[PDB]
Amino acid sequence: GHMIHKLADVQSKNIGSGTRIWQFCVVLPSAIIGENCNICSHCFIENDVKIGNNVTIKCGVQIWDGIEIEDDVFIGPNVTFCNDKYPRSKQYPKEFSKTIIKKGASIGANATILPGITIGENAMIGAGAIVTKDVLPHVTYYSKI
Template identity: 40%
Template sequence: MTPSPLVDPAVPAAAGTRIADSADVSSDANIGSGSSIWHLAQVRESAVLGENCIIGRGAYIGTGVRMGDNCKVQNYALVYEPAVLGAGVFIGPAVVLTNDTYPRAVTPDGQLKSAHDWEPVGVVIGDGASIGARATCVAPVIIGAWATVAAGAVVVKDVPDFALVVGVPARRVGWVGKAGVPLTETEPGVWVCPTTGSRYLETEGVLALEEQ
């Protein structure tokens, strides 16, 4: 019987985990059950992936990155340590989560920098948030829960929960609900999802789902 191309017996993983034979997954990574890591992806040492995560072709997951359940990291995205992703986060194709605010290849005296010459800083993404294709999040920033970063945006400051941000640098242009669809303001401070009918209340620039 021919082995599945998405099972690598050399990498210890939870039951139901699928790893392409061309993927490079550290034996020190912790991969949750039901997760899939596709061709040419790399998952580094001490990375922790939750259950049912999908890591697309050519994606990079840095050392010690933490990811909740049901996350999707699309093809060729770069998630550098020490990024932290909540549950249900979507990372679009070719997204970059940086980790160096003031990058330099060399020290002031011209010597090649080593890992001891700089302090990595990370991007933190809340549950359910989505980062569109080719967007860049410049660490350190926090992307709020259920927020949406539009394709090609460059995020240089924190993004509130449920915010829709676009542009370079990214700015808020509206609100989105848990369904990801832009909300409609039906009266001052009251926003409604046209898909689910859920109501959200805005108070001093902060949006929250109305309690039932």
Template identity: 40%
Template sequence: METVTINTPKQSLNNVTIGEGVKIFDFVNAYGCTIGDGSKVGAFVEIQKGVTIGRNCKISSHTFICEGVHIADRVFVGHGVMFTNDLFPRATRPDGQPQTADDWQLVETHIEEGVSIGSNATIICGITIGAHAMIGAGAVVTKDIPPYGVAIGNPARVIKTINPE
């Protein structure tokens, strides 16, 4: 498996703004997004337009990051994490015609600095995961998680708070 390593200041490839020292593994589908300095993106990841990924993040393989997701610096995203951006997705309008971009409302999600998201978690749109929070593997996050909170389960619930020190 090959990787693309960007060692020069800010480059653009496929309308993606790529920071210095970024590593992108094979089979990544990224378009119209921004990936910050020193971040790593694993194989089989999709990053859609308008996504921002901060510096020194690790996005593990098989993850889907859709339009409207904003990830701050030093965030870990485990394998197979799924983000959403529509609270009421439909394939068609009430008249049976296929939906277009005008038929739905983008709902943004914010992942703050230092968050860790376990493998196979699902992040429902419209929430904020606070700085340094931890999301357990397989969790389904449906509401805001406070800074330093540890959340597990479906739906995810905060079970404790990590000592910031």
């Protein structure tokens, strides 16, 4: 009982009941997605990826290898994640940096999350923020304009 749009390319069988995956999403085979998620249009979800239950991923987000999203997380549109702190074309690290977005946290629209980051339970990341350090549980963080 999950809904995969005919215009998505979903290669993972590991998708929970109630989850919706919308148009022009790519989901690679090893991705794990929980129950009652909403994966909005134009998202990319790689292999070494775990996403919990009741997660909302708005449009235009990519979830790279090494990223874990816990239950009840909200990820705003065009939010960007990283798994490589010093990227150079065709220079593959032995191991990708890991990011974890902990239960109930929310990431505002168009925020940028550096590699290796923990965002604590129920944190709120302001729209457009750059997150270069871990954010503590329940903290509201935004970049000064």
